[PDB]
Amino acid sequence: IIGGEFTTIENQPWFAAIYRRHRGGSVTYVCGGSLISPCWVISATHCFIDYPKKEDYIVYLGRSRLNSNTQGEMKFEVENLILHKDYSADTLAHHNDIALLKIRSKEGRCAQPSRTIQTIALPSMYNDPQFGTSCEITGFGKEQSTDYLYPEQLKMTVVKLISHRECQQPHYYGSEVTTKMLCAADPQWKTDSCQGDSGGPLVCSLQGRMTLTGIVSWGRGCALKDKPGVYTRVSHFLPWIRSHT
Ligand SMILES: COc1ncc(-c2nc(C(=O)NC(=N)N)c(N)nc2N)c(OC)n1
Numbered sequence: 001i002i003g004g005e006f007t008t009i010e011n012q013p014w015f016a017a018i019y020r021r022h023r024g025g026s027v028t029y030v031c032g033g034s035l036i037s038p039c040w041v042i043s044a045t046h047c048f049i050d051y052p053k054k055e056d057y058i059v060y061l062g063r064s065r066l067n068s069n070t071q072g073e074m075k076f077e078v079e080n081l082i083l084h085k086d087y088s089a090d091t092l093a094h095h096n097d098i099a100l101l102k103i104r105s106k107e108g109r110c111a112q113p114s115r116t117i118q119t120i121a122l123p124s125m126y127n128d129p130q131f132g133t134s135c136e137i138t139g140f141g142k143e144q145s146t147d148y149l150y151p152e153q154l155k156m157t158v159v160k161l162i163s164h165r166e167c168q169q170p171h172y173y174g175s176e177v178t179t180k181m182l183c184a185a186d187p188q189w190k191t192d193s194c195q196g197d198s199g200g201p202l203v204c205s206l207q208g209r210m211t212l213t214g215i216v217s218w219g220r221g222c223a224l225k226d227k228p229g230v231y232t233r234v235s236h237f238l239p240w241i242r243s244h245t
Contacts, residue, residue, distance in 0.1 A: 040245050083099050215234065
């Protein structure tokens, strides 16, 4: 997250931190996700496509920090790793950049909800906010594009929905963007998601309800003029989400 502000897990209690085991026992951060039900986290397929084996991954919930334990957190193995059959990688774009992780603990359990651990609602079918709507994004990704390190503390910021007609322009992303994608950005290009934020939530207030409108997917740079952040448009995948769960 370029710009924005620091936060803790209580503000975004559905945020999931996804890590990978290494040969030689290193554990590195991979991607954010969102708890949509006690046993299901949702995320981006591109996060996992190079290491598509479930035993390599660990999911944490209720965790506000990258390399220290947060009081109250729950740790899971991935019982099930579901990548979208129609995934494709463009030069920038990712199509169908959506994945599901089934989580179960060493003791064999799913998430118990708490002050630090809650679910996020999914949108109603094909129902998105108007462009110009402010939504919020969360993740452990870089604070600047040049940074080598990821922040140790979870961050969030605000970006505004951009119309497809507008994202569709050349000047912008041209045809790279599709109707199964959304674009969002700061009017000044002052704040954005960046590397490390992929798979995390884009949450919008919809009918007085906090709703998972998008999943951080791609962009050209972070926080640059005419290069919004691109998000998997969740309201176009509900049957996929419903079937595989
Ligand atoms: C050298 O150009 C370049 N720079 C950054 C990314 C980049 N962007 C994002 C992202 O989400 N950006 C955004 N929302 N604005 C991401 N999660 N990860 C990445 N590595 C990239 O993509 C290959 N290319």
